[PDB]
Amino acid sequence: TLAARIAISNLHKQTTKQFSKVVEDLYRYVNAATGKPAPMISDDVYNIVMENKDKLNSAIVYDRDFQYSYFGFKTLERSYLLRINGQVAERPQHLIMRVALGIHGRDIEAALETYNLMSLKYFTHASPTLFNAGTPKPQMSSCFLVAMKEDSIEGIYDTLKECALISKTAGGIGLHIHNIRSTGSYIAGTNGTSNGLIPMIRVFNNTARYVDGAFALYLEPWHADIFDFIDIRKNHGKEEIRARDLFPALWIPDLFMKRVEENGTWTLFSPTSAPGLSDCYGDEFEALYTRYEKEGRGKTIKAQKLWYSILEAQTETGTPFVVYKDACNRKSNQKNLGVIKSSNLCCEIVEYSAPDETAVCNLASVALPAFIETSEDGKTSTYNFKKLHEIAKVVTRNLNRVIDRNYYPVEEARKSNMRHRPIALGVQGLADTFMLLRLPFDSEEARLLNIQIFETIYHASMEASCELAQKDGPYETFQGSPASQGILQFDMWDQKPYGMWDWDTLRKDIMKHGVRNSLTMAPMPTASTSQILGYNECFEPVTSNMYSFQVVNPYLLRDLVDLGIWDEGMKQYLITQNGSIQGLPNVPQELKDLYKTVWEISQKTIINMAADRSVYIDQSHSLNLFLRAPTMGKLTSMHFYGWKKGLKTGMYYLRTQ
Amino acid sequence: TLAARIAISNLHKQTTKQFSKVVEDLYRYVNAATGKPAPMISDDVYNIVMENKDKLNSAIVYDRDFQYSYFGFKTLERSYLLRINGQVAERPQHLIMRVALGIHGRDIEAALETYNLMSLKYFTHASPTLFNAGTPKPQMSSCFLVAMKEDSIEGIYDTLKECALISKTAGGIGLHIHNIRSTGSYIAGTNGTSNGLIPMIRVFNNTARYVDGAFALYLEPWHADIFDFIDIRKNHGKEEIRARDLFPALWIPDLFMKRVEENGTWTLFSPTSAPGLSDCYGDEFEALYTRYEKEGRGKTIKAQKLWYSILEAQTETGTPFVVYKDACNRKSNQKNLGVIKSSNLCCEIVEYSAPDETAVCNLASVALPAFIETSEDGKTSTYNFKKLHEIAKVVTRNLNRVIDRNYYPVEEARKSNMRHRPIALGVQGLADTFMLLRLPFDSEEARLLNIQIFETIYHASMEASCELAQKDGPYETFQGSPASQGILQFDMWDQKPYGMWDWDTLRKDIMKHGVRNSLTMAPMPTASTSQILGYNECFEPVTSNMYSFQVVNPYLLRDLVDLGIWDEGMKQYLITQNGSIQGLPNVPQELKDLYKTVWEISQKTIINMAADRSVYIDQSHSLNLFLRAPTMGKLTSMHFYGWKKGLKTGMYYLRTQ
């Protein structure tokens, strides 16, 4: 762990110190191999730096470069810090300043503040923002939700064209394909027999390979090609019938879940024969689905045949993902726009898309542990909910600026983002926060900290967003939204807020002034950006207390040494048992309870905590499920338990073994 | 061979006899399985039949249905005659009448005449015309020459979209890709390194598989990806580096051929580094190529390294095809349009294409044997060049009507066809004609018959086309064409016409009145339509005197029986020696000479005959090469011999073993 001083320290001195000078170099860079100028800074951001070089250079506390962990820094080193010629040109602080300015433009105040909070590791922005902010083509946004334009060669290939343009600049795509004809449907244009979804999937998999880049595909389980669709990632099967890079997601209506429970029938349709199904939900969906069912427009099967197949795919491949169409639509502030037809690659975003609107993910995350405080007389940590609420207001504002200063690879993405202005704050180091505060993940304390943390972020972002609506008007589409009627997220869960913040006032202001953002919260994966800040992925508990390159949970070993039981007889068994400390001869019960692995935490608790926090989530959140010795019945009750909690995302991956 | 009476005769009576009634049924057909009306006749063509039913029904000589050979009829039975419900609804005569009307509309005279000449087997139209003429979406045209629109994701995917729309309705595509960036070129849009042509080819191969459909790809041999390009059909090699359905074609400039001969250097370029090369030819091409070469913009190699690789691919796969860019451009009447960048899938069409013009093949073929005449006192056959000239005038007119009444799957194809109005007559049963007239293919007689036959077809079509220019104006683009200056095809070969027809008069009329067609002649493969009429493929000699299902050359065995040597000791050896009669103990020398196989005919003779006839070919023609025990040197001198004759298509397939 001391190797990180020398790693930073040495590459601290292979680098120009004056920030403006690094900008100069990057601004000026030329591709020696081709003699083309390759500016790595934008005209806009360059001029700003020059017109402000003293304020900017002397704001930068270069000491903060040691605020980065072991491989934390090496992650930045590897892929984030801009390189002049194979060599790292930016210091970490330059990256942050560039990003700060890239977000904030002329607003030097805002820029400076974001520089500070970021550099002190209070929050961060998504990877694309960190790569691209402040650069000639500033694509700051991660993923994109794409509609399949129309069920025809023209619509398919325009969609394919769109995904190629998007996939160029990388970034994730969630594509919904409910409207595409199934295997054997009549073709007007020449002769009949379509060959279905798979051959078309195959075109998308090929086009993705060509340009890159992961691709998520969204499908309702009444589609006639559903059985093949869920095996898109299985090994054996057939030859010309899959794809090694696409992630299948189910977009499940309630009726399906019920049909399974009741051990009844389920009907598969081609959309050509059963038009409109993906364009309604809840009671209206069921009225139309049943009618189509009685009119014998499909092929009836046993709901449990399908259900068992879903379970099998998941057991073997960890997919398909499961997201609940009706929870998503019933409990969304975008419900005035139309029916939402999919989530994203990571299962947190639930935003509206259409042939001409490609929804965009605008993401940043808050470092939950940075609000822990010893404060007040003695050895006791508290959590500063005022400082959290504050940071969340800052990040809300940033992400609005990102909306405006983002480069959009396709016009559909610009239409959607400008029009509905959705935002997606998330979090990292929930697990850390718990451990720092000495709270087991399953503790009644952790349960209550979960709720409060999320209440304050939702409260903060809605307040900050209302503030922006006063300055700049509501988003275009605000009129007739749940929020415009004073129905906020938790209201749609038929609940009362935990009440740490005053919701009445905010609700009164919202009804009065609007909000700038149709949506605000989507706790995401953050795999990469939470390695940068040295934290556990997001809102999940730790998967191990050991990482590979042989590092132990910093809070765990500290404790071991304070009790002086930390030795080699111990070091050995930590490796011995996939980073578990349960069943360790000389380890205090308070430690075993605190440093439980996610394989040791009740999934019922996890679903509950996800359900608790869900009432403050505008959108959804990426709920991975972890099963030890997985059985059909165990998987079945976990899906159904989540389903009945009203979750939108019942499952992201199924991680097993 | 008597089984064909019963095959026709029986299916002659499973079929309504009144032509109008079959049209009625076809007009009225409904897809029982879906309850959608599936009209197999167009509104337009239906009304015409009804308004003319007596004239039409009583014009039809149903006896002509026995004018069809053994498997000749069974080819029609299999794929051409329209089917009501899995069952054959059209008789052959109905097919011809439908096609006739489908071409001729209200012009009942023209329709009736075409019905007669077709039914008497004087000529026929291409397969798509026979399938689709007279139907709701009358796509009567075979192939399409497509330009790659631009070297960018947008241009690539628009082209891909175009090919998908075209490939839907089937029909061949010749796509030229000279302008696409090569492996390792800088990409502005994000980071550099393109991955080249193969990955992009792969996208096209995938999109072709999805919709169908053969695909021809055209490339100049200075493209930096040329080595991989020519192996697109090789077996071993690598994994992610080919395609099992695309046919690679070289578009060879003279300079390449010279560099090989001189055993010098050849330079590979990415088009990004060497812009414009595909947009010039001849001296201008060489001036620009050399300049780029001296400016060190490419990678220099030995011309013979490449050349040897070409030869290897051809030896193993029969490809790539070879078409000579400069012969094609120098000797084309479309030279006023711009530089022609490719031929078609079958190597006969040389028409101009561009991002907004997709050239179209409008094909029909004349049955050369149908003009043989015993005429004048005794046992002597002559050839009626007056009756040929006549039929060729009829077919020229048809193909103009096809231009106008064709359905175009994409707008680019409509733009090109309407604007330049190119036509493509061909032939079948050259070999038959020779054999019927007792002329060995290598005879001085056959050589001279070749020339005359082609002089009369070119003369006929140009005359007929001039006639149409008087009635309806020249094509839009005629002004400033070789033909407008009185430079006809043979003039561009620096030759005098053989002079059987009067060219002066015609040339005088053309200069005076124009022509309706930019181009007229493209002797094509005709594999399928020449089975319908019972003839050897086209302008090639017979490949065997036996076919598989054990049939012998009708002219050969007749002769054997007239000499009474036809027995079982003979029948056996015909199978014995891949249908060769050379080296047969008791077979007259006059037979051996007459019934030579294409493996027994001097390829120098074939090239010569192709060169002779080429001076009357507006476009090109599909010259297959046949090599017994193939060596590099033998292949080399055959390419170069053709090359120096000035051929446009030096090679279609290389057929070997």
PDB file of N, CA, C and O in Angstrom, chain A residues 31 36 137 153-154 156-158 160-161 164-165 168-169 186 189-190 195 199-200 202-203 206-207 209-211 240, chain B residues 31 34 36 137 153-154 156-158 160-161 164-165 168-169 186 189-190 195 199-200 202-203 206-207 209-211 240:
ATOM      1  N   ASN A  31      -1.156  14.727 -34.031  1.00  0.00           N
ATOM      2  CA  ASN A  31      -0.926  13.320 -34.317  1.00  0.00           C
ATOM      3  C   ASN A  31       0.306  13.225 -35.210  1.00  0.00           C
ATOM      4  O   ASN A  31       0.215  13.399 -36.444  1.00  0.00           O
ATOM      5  N   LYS A  36      -2.103  15.482 -38.513  1.00  0.00           N
ATOM      6  CA  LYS A  36      -3.396  16.119 -38.220  1.00  0.00           C
ATOM      7  C   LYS A  36      -3.362  16.660 -36.811  1.00  0.00           C
ATOM      8  O   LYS A  36      -2.888  15.992 -35.906  1.00  0.00           O
ATOM      9  N   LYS A 137     -15.422  16.979 -28.597  1.00  0.00           N
ATOM     10  CA  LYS A 137     -16.756  16.386 -28.700  1.00  0.00           C
ATOM     11  C   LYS A 137     -17.197  15.842 -27.349  1.00  0.00           C
ATOM     12  O   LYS A 137     -17.027  14.646 -27.075  1.00  0.00           O
ATOM     13  N   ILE A 153     -38.061  -3.137 -43.027  1.00  0.00           N
ATOM     14  CA  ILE A 153     -36.648  -3.004 -43.382  1.00  0.00           C
ATOM     15  C   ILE A 153     -36.164  -1.578 -43.168  1.00  0.00           C
ATOM     16  O   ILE A 153     -35.079  -1.374 -42.611  1.00  0.00           O
ATOM     17  N   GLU A 154     -36.985  -0.604 -43.560  1.00  0.00           N
ATOM     18  CA  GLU A 154     -36.607   0.801 -43.421  1.00  0.00           C
ATOM     19  C   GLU A 154     -36.415   1.177 -41.946  1.00  0.00           C
ATOM     20  O   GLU A 154     -35.404   1.814 -41.580  1.00  0.00           O
ATOM     21  N   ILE A 156     -36.061  -0.933 -39.232  1.00  0.00           N
ATOM     22  CA  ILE A 156     -34.960  -1.731 -38.688  1.00  0.00           C
ATOM     23  C   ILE A 156     -33.572  -1.149 -38.986  1.00  0.00           C
ATOM     24  O   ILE A 156     -32.767  -0.938 -38.060  1.00  0.00           O
ATOM     25  N   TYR A 157     -33.317  -0.866 -40.265  1.00  0.00           N
ATOM     26  CA  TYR A 157     -32.037  -0.304 -40.711  1.00  0.00           C
ATOM     27  C   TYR A 157     -31.823   1.146 -40.290  1.00  0.00           C
ATOM     28  O   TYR A 157     -30.679   1.556 -40.122  1.00  0.00           O
ATOM     29  N   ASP A 158     -32.885   1.929 -40.079  1.00  0.00           N
ATOM     30  CA  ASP A 158     -32.676   3.274 -39.509  1.00  0.00           C
ATOM     31  C   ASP A 158     -32.278   3.163 -38.043  1.00  0.00           C
ATOM     32  O   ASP A 158     -31.396   3.902 -37.552  1.00  0.00           O
ATOM     33  N   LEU A 160     -30.802   0.523 -36.791  1.00  0.00           N
ATOM     34  CA  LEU A 160     -29.451  -0.014 -36.852  1.00  0.00           C
ATOM     35  C   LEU A 160     -28.445   1.106 -37.120  1.00  0.00           C
ATOM     36  O   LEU A 160     -27.379   1.160 -36.480  1.00  0.00           O
ATOM     37  N   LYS A 161     -28.814   2.026 -38.020  1.00  0.00           N
ATOM     38  CA  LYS A 161     -27.967   3.178 -38.320  1.00  0.00           C
ATOM     39  C   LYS A 161     -27.744   4.028 -37.076  1.00  0.00           C
ATOM     40  O   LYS A 161     -26.607   4.397 -36.770  1.00  0.00           O
ATOM     41  N   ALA A 164     -25.442   2.418 -34.631  1.00  0.00           N
ATOM     42  CA  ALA A 164     -24.076   2.445 -35.109  1.00  0.00           C
ATOM     43  C   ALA A 164     -23.462   3.793 -34.819  1.00  0.00           C
ATOM     44  O   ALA A 164     -22.383   3.859 -34.241  1.00  0.00           O
ATOM     45  N   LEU A 165     -24.154   4.865 -35.197  1.00  0.00           N
ATOM     46  CA  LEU A 165     -23.728   6.220 -34.823  1.00  0.00           C
ATOM     47  C   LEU A 165     -23.481   6.361 -33.305  1.00  0.00           C
ATOM     48  O   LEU A 165     -22.433   6.870 -32.896  1.00  0.00           O
ATOM     49  N   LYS A 168     -20.577   4.105 -31.990  1.00  0.00           N
ATOM     50  CA  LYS A 168     -19.308   4.673 -32.406  1.00  0.00           C
ATOM     51  C   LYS A 168     -18.647   5.292 -31.184  1.00  0.00           C
ATOM     52  O   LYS A 168     -17.602   4.829 -30.742  1.00  0.00           O
ATOM     53  N   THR A 169     -19.294   6.310 -30.621  1.00  0.00           N
ATOM     54  CA  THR A 169     -18.796   7.006 -29.438  1.00  0.00           C
ATOM     55  C   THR A 169     -18.898   6.137 -28.187  1.00  0.00           C
ATOM     56  O   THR A 169     -18.794   6.653 -27.079  1.00  0.00           O
ATOM     57  N   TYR A 186     -46.583 -13.396 -41.723  1.00  0.00           N
ATOM     58  CA  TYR A 186     -46.745 -13.046 -43.120  1.00  0.00           C
ATOM     59  C   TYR A 186     -45.994 -11.750 -43.423  1.00  0.00           C
ATOM     60  O   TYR A 186     -46.093 -10.770 -42.662  1.00  0.00           O
ATOM     61  N   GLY A 189     -44.631  -7.212 -48.293  1.00  0.00           N
ATOM     62  CA  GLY A 189     -43.597  -6.827 -49.285  1.00  0.00           C
ATOM     63  C   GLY A 189     -43.118  -7.798 -50.373  1.00  0.00           C
ATOM     64  O   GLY A 189     -42.763  -7.358 -51.481  1.00  0.00           O
ATOM     65  N   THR A 190     -43.072  -9.101 -50.062  1.00  0.00           N
ATOM     66  CA  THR A 190     -42.753 -10.152 -51.061  1.00  0.00           C
ATOM     67  C   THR A 190     -43.566 -11.439 -50.841  1.00  0.00           C
ATOM     68  O   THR A 190     -44.756 -11.501 -51.183  1.00  0.00           O
ATOM     69  N   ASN A 195     -38.305 -14.638 -40.317  1.00  0.00           N
ATOM     70  CA  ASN A 195     -37.477 -15.601 -39.589  1.00  0.00           C
ATOM     71  C   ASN A 195     -37.271 -15.217 -38.116  1.00  0.00           C
ATOM     72  O   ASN A 195     -36.576 -15.919 -37.361  1.00  0.00           O
ATOM     73  N   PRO A 199     -32.430 -13.775 -36.048  1.00  0.00           N
ATOM     74  CA  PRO A 199     -31.699 -13.270 -37.226  1.00  0.00           C
ATOM     75  C   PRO A 199     -31.492 -11.757 -37.201  1.00  0.00           C
ATOM     76  O   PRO A 199     -30.401 -11.297 -37.516  1.00  0.00           O
ATOM     77  N   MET A 200     -32.519 -11.001 -36.814  1.00  0.00           N
ATOM     78  CA  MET A 200     -32.393  -9.557 -36.594  1.00  0.00           C
ATOM     79  C   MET A 200     -31.457  -9.189 -35.424  1.00  0.00           C
ATOM     80  O   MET A 200     -30.632  -8.300 -35.568  1.00  0.00           O
ATOM     81  N   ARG A 202     -29.016 -10.892 -34.539  1.00  0.00           N
ATOM     82  CA  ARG A 202     -27.732 -11.225 -35.126  1.00  0.00           C
ATOM     83  C   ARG A 202     -27.126 -10.062 -35.922  1.00  0.00           C
ATOM     84  O   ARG A 202     -25.922  -9.867 -35.920  1.00  0.00           O
ATOM     85  N   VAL A 203     -27.987  -9.285 -36.577  1.00  0.00           N
ATOM     86  CA  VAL A 203     -27.567  -8.134 -37.359  1.00  0.00           C
ATOM     87  C   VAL A 203     -27.043  -7.065 -36.414  1.00  0.00           C
ATOM     88  O   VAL A 203     -26.052  -6.397 -36.711  1.00  0.00           O
ATOM     89  N   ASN A 206     -23.713  -8.232 -34.936  1.00  0.00           N
ATOM     90  CA  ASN A 206     -22.683  -7.974 -35.906  1.00  0.00           C
ATOM     91  C   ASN A 206     -22.284  -6.496 -36.013  1.00  0.00           C
ATOM     92  O   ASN A 206     -21.102  -6.198 -36.033  1.00  0.00           O
ATOM     93  N   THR A 207     -23.265  -5.593 -36.070  1.00  0.00           N
ATOM     94  CA  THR A 207     -23.042  -4.144 -36.158  1.00  0.00           C
ATOM     95  C   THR A 207     -22.370  -3.540 -34.924  1.00  0.00           C
ATOM     96  O   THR A 207     -21.678  -2.526 -35.020  1.00  0.00           O
ATOM     97  N   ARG A 209     -20.238  -5.435 -32.993  1.00  0.00           N
ATOM     98  CA  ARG A 209     -18.853  -5.922 -33.116  1.00  0.00           C
ATOM     99  C   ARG A 209     -18.052  -5.049 -34.078  1.00  0.00           C
ATOM    100  O   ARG A 209     -16.893  -4.744 -33.823  1.00  0.00           O
ATOM    101  N   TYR A 210     -18.698  -4.624 -35.155  1.00  0.00           N
ATOM    102  CA  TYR A 210     -18.044  -3.857 -36.203  1.00  0.00           C
ATOM    103  C   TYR A 210     -17.574  -2.492 -35.725  1.00  0.00           C
ATOM    104  O   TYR A 210     -16.467  -2.079 -36.060  1.00  0.00           O
ATOM    105  N   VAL A 211     -18.405  -1.790 -34.955  1.00  0.00           N
ATOM    106  CA  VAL A 211     -18.077  -0.415 -34.558  1.00  0.00           C
ATOM    107  C   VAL A 211     -17.224  -0.340 -33.270  1.00  0.00           C
ATOM    108  O   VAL A 211     -16.250   0.409 -33.238  1.00  0.00           O
ATOM    109  N   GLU A 240     -26.827 -21.092 -35.758  1.00  0.00           N
ATOM    110  CA  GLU A 240     -27.235 -19.762 -36.214  1.00  0.00           C
ATOM    111  C   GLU A 240     -28.373 -19.146 -35.359  1.00  0.00           C
ATOM    112  O   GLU A 240     -29.329 -18.560 -35.900  1.00  0.00           O
TER     113      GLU A 240
ATOM    114  N   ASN B  31     -54.998 -15.547 -49.238  1.00  0.00           N
ATOM    115  CA  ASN B  31     -54.157 -16.342 -48.359  1.00  0.00           C
ATOM    116  C   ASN B  31     -55.053 -16.939 -47.278  1.00  0.00           C
ATOM    117  O   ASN B  31     -55.372 -16.271 -46.272  1.00  0.00           O
ATOM    118  N   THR B  34     -54.386 -16.558 -43.494  1.00  0.00           N
ATOM    119  CA  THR B  34     -54.326 -15.254 -42.841  1.00  0.00           C
ATOM    120  C   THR B  34     -55.500 -14.361 -43.230  1.00  0.00           C
ATOM    121  O   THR B  34     -55.646 -13.251 -42.718  1.00  0.00           O
ATOM    122  N   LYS B  36     -55.852 -12.597 -45.758  1.00  0.00           N
ATOM    123  CA  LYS B  36     -55.440 -11.421 -46.540  1.00  0.00           C
ATOM    124  C   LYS B  36     -55.581 -11.743 -48.008  1.00  0.00           C
ATOM    125  O   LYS B  36     -55.207 -12.820 -48.442  1.00  0.00           O
ATOM    126  N   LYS B 137     -46.463  -6.007 -57.856  1.00  0.00           N
ATOM    127  CA  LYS B 137     -45.191  -5.287 -57.788  1.00  0.00           C
ATOM    128  C   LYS B 137     -44.235  -5.803 -58.852  1.00  0.00           C
ATOM    129  O   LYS B 137     -43.400  -6.674 -58.568  1.00  0.00           O
ATOM    130  N   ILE B 153     -19.951   6.138 -41.275  1.00  0.00           N
ATOM    131  CA  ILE B 153     -21.023   5.306 -40.731  1.00  0.00           C
ATOM    132  C   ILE B 153     -22.348   5.611 -41.412  1.00  0.00           C
ATOM    133  O   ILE B 153     -23.082   4.683 -41.773  1.00  0.00           O
ATOM    134  N   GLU B 154     -22.626   6.895 -41.630  1.00  0.00           N
ATOM    135  CA  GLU B 154     -23.882   7.300 -42.257  1.00  0.00           C
ATOM    136  C   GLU B 154     -23.989   6.747 -43.684  1.00  0.00           C
ATOM    137  O   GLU B 154     -25.035   6.181 -44.070  1.00  0.00           O
ATOM    138  N   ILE B 156     -22.105   4.251 -45.155  1.00  0.00           N
ATOM    139  CA  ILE B 156     -22.107   2.788 -45.088  1.00  0.00           C
ATOM    140  C   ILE B 156     -23.485   2.187 -44.786  1.00  0.00           C
ATOM    141  O   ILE B 156     -23.971   1.319 -45.534  1.00  0.00           O
ATOM    142  N   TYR B 157     -24.115   2.675 -43.715  1.00  0.00           N
ATOM    143  CA  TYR B 157     -25.440   2.205 -43.294  1.00  0.00           C
ATOM    144  C   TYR B 157     -26.570   2.638 -44.223  1.00  0.00           C
ATOM    145  O   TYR B 157     -27.571   1.935 -44.312  1.00  0.00           O
ATOM    146  N   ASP B 158     -26.429   3.752 -44.946  1.00  0.00           N
ATOM    147  CA  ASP B 158     -27.448   4.072 -45.965  1.00  0.00           C
ATOM    148  C   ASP B 158     -27.325   3.114 -47.143  1.00  0.00           C
ATOM    149  O   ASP B 158     -28.339   2.646 -47.707  1.00  0.00           O
ATOM    150  N   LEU B 160     -26.058   0.108 -46.870  1.00  0.00           N
ATOM    151  CA  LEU B 160     -26.534  -1.154 -46.324  1.00  0.00           C
ATOM    152  C   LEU B 160     -28.063  -1.199 -46.346  1.00  0.00           C
ATOM    153  O   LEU B 160     -28.656  -2.226 -46.723  1.00  0.00           O
ATOM    154  N   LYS B 161     -28.690  -0.068 -46.000  1.00  0.00           N
ATOM    155  CA  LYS B 161     -30.147   0.035 -46.038  1.00  0.00           C
ATOM    156  C   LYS B 161     -30.672  -0.195 -47.450  1.00  0.00           C
ATOM    157  O   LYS B 161     -31.611  -0.971 -47.646  1.00  0.00           O
ATOM    158  N   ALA B 164     -30.457  -3.762 -48.497  1.00  0.00           N
ATOM    159  CA  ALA B 164     -31.446  -4.566 -47.810  1.00  0.00           C
ATOM    160  C   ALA B 164     -32.781  -4.429 -48.500  1.00  0.00           C
ATOM    161  O   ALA B 164     -33.404  -5.434 -48.825  1.00  0.00           O
ATOM    162  N   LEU B 165     -33.211  -3.194 -48.746  1.00  0.00           N
ATOM    163  CA  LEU B 165     -34.415  -2.950 -49.551  1.00  0.00           C
ATOM    164  C   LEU B 165     -34.373  -3.685 -50.909  1.00  0.00           C
ATOM    165  O   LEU B 165     -35.338  -4.363 -51.272  1.00  0.00           O
ATOM    166  N   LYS B 168     -34.290  -7.575 -50.565  1.00  0.00           N
ATOM    167  CA  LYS B 168     -35.606  -8.045 -50.175  1.00  0.00           C
ATOM    168  C   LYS B 168     -36.243  -8.713 -51.384  1.00  0.00           C
ATOM    169  O   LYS B 168     -36.478  -9.916 -51.376  1.00  0.00           O
ATOM    170  N   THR B 169     -36.472  -7.927 -52.434  1.00  0.00           N
ATOM    171  CA  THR B 169     -37.071  -8.418 -53.672  1.00  0.00           C
ATOM    172  C   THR B 169     -36.110  -9.317 -54.446  1.00  0.00           C
ATOM    173  O   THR B 169     -36.337  -9.579 -55.622  1.00  0.00           O
ATOM    174  N   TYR B 186      -6.625   6.514 -39.911  1.00  0.00           N
ATOM    175  CA  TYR B 186      -7.061   7.395 -38.846  1.00  0.00           C
ATOM    176  C   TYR B 186      -8.564   7.646 -38.961  1.00  0.00           C
ATOM    177  O   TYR B 186      -9.076   7.924 -40.061  1.00  0.00           O
ATOM    178  N   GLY B 189     -13.781  11.038 -36.231  1.00  0.00           N
ATOM    179  CA  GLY B 189     -14.927  10.882 -35.301  1.00  0.00           C
ATOM    180  C   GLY B 189     -14.730  10.463 -33.838  1.00  0.00           C
ATOM    181  O   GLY B 189     -15.506  10.889 -32.963  1.00  0.00           O
ATOM    182  N   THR B 190     -13.730   9.613 -33.567  1.00  0.00           N
ATOM    183  CA  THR B 190     -13.354   9.234 -32.182  1.00  0.00           C
ATOM    184  C   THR B 190     -11.834   9.067 -32.010  1.00  0.00           C
ATOM    185  O   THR B 190     -11.096  10.059 -31.919  1.00  0.00           O
ATOM    186  N   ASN B 195     -10.711  -0.868 -38.988  1.00  0.00           N
ATOM    187  CA  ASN B 195     -10.379  -2.292 -39.072  1.00  0.00           C
ATOM    188  C   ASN B 195     -10.502  -2.849 -40.498  1.00  0.00           C
ATOM    189  O   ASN B 195     -10.273  -4.047 -40.740  1.00  0.00           O
ATOM    190  N   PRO B 199     -14.251  -6.535 -41.960  1.00  0.00           N
ATOM    191  CA  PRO B 199     -15.329  -6.326 -40.975  1.00  0.00           C
ATOM    192  C   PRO B 199     -16.580  -5.692 -41.580  1.00  0.00           C
ATOM    193  O   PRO B 199     -17.682  -6.129 -41.271  1.00  0.00           O
ATOM    194  N   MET B 200     -16.408  -4.689 -42.442  1.00  0.00           N
ATOM    195  CA  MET B 200     -17.516  -4.112 -43.207  1.00  0.00           C
ATOM    196  C   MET B 200     -18.153  -5.095 -44.211  1.00  0.00           C
ATOM    197  O   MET B 200     -19.369  -5.179 -44.285  1.00  0.00           O
ATOM    198  N   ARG B 202     -18.271  -8.171 -43.806  1.00  0.00           N
ATOM    199  CA  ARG B 202     -18.963  -9.059 -42.890  1.00  0.00           C
ATOM    200  C   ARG B 202     -20.373  -8.567 -42.541  1.00  0.00           C
ATOM    201  O   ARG B 202     -21.287  -9.358 -42.381  1.00  0.00           O
ATOM    202  N   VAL B 203     -20.531  -7.247 -42.451  1.00  0.00           N
ATOM    203  CA  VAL B 203     -21.811  -6.628 -42.147  1.00  0.00           C
ATOM    204  C   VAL B 203     -22.750  -6.844 -43.323  1.00  0.00           C
ATOM    205  O   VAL B 203     -23.938  -7.104 -43.135  1.00  0.00           O
ATOM    206  N   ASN B 206     -23.715 -10.542 -43.487  1.00  0.00           N
ATOM    207  CA  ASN B 206     -24.760 -10.770 -42.526  1.00  0.00           C
ATOM    208  C   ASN B 206     -26.134 -10.243 -42.960  1.00  0.00           C
ATOM    209  O   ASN B 206     -27.114 -10.954 -42.828  1.00  0.00           O
ATOM    210  N   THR B 207     -26.188  -9.014 -43.478  1.00  0.00           N
ATOM    211  CA  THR B 207     -27.424  -8.378 -43.953  1.00  0.00           C
ATOM    212  C   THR B 207     -28.055  -9.067 -45.164  1.00  0.00           C
ATOM    213  O   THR B 207     -29.270  -9.006 -45.358  1.00  0.00           O
ATOM    214  N   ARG B 209     -27.624 -12.447 -45.671  1.00  0.00           N
ATOM    215  CA  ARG B 209     -28.171 -13.682 -45.083  1.00  0.00           C
ATOM    216  C   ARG B 209     -29.525 -13.419 -44.428  1.00  0.00           C
ATOM    217  O   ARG B 209     -30.441 -14.224 -44.547  1.00  0.00           O
ATOM    218  N   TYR B 210     -29.644 -12.271 -43.776  1.00  0.00           N
ATOM    219  CA  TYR B 210     -30.841 -11.919 -43.030  1.00  0.00           C
ATOM    220  C   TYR B 210     -32.059 -11.745 -43.923  1.00  0.00           C
ATOM    221  O   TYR B 210     -33.140 -12.211 -43.574  1.00  0.00           O
ATOM    222  N   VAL B 211     -31.895 -11.075 -45.063  1.00  0.00           N
ATOM    223  CA  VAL B 211     -33.046 -10.757 -45.917  1.00  0.00           C
ATOM    224  C   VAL B 211     -33.389 -11.882 -46.922  1.00  0.00           C
ATOM    225  O   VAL B 211     -34.561 -12.223 -47.064  1.00  0.00           O
ATOM    226  N   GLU B 240     -12.340 -14.677 -38.077  1.00  0.00           N
ATOM    227  CA  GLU B 240     -13.159 -13.485 -38.302  1.00  0.00           C
ATOM    228  C   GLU B 240     -12.718 -12.668 -39.544  1.00  0.00           C
ATOM    229  O   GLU B 240     -12.651 -11.424 -39.497  1.00  0.00           O
TER     230      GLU B 240
END
